[PDB]
Structure 1
């Protein structure tokens, strides 16, 4: 499995999370409100967002990335994949994540 992250404006965040799960694109999404500060075209932006932390099979990462790009309201969406130590993780959990990612 791997973990992927995106930041979304708050309303879109909850809606898109639900859709990724309903479509079995991801097994689980954890949503955290965040304050994001970032550079964009010579401006410093300070925004209310929500972080989606998405748990998905390794094989399903491409499908997630494509669906995120279809749904994401931003011209340049965040999509960052974090490496999981699959051996050290609980094997029954990684299998669950694999099984729910259709």
Structure 2
């Protein structure tokens, strides 16, 4: 399995996106939590309060998921970061696989 990390400007946009992904079976679970983002933007550093989203799904769904996220994300150029999970307990993997599309 893999985790995909992306961030949102608020809870409504974040929840809408994750629920849409769940409905479309592109991810099995999402963990959302707030954070303060500090970053470079057009010549100056910006500070925004965001909602980070840790998505859990299959490596086989990475490409499809990445493209779907692009279509749904409020940011024109959002962060869609893939970090592979080296290993996970068999019972959880079984669940994640059953809950996601082939």
Contiguous gaps of at least 5 residues in structure 2 = none
2:79 equivalent in structure 1? 78
How high is the TM-score relative to the length of structure 1?
0.92
Mapping of residues 18-57 of structure 1, within 5 Å: 18-57=19-58
Q: Which runs of 5+ in 1 are unaligned?
A: none
Number of matched residues?
A: 100
Q: Normalising by the residue count of structure 2, what TM-score does the alignment of the two structures yield?
A: 0.92
What is the root-mean-square deviation in Å for CA atoms of aligned residues? 1.0
Q: Which residue of 1 aligns with 2:6?
A: 6
Q: For the residues of structure 1 that align with 2:21 and 2:60, how far apart are their CA atoms?
A: 15
Measured after TM superposition, the shift of residue 92 of structure 1 is 1.5
CA offset at residue 83 of structure 1? 1.9
1:20-47 per-position Cα deviation (integer Å, ceiling 9, x unaligned) = 1111110001110111111112121101
Residue in 1 aligned with 2:90? 91
Structure 1 SS opposite 2:59: coil
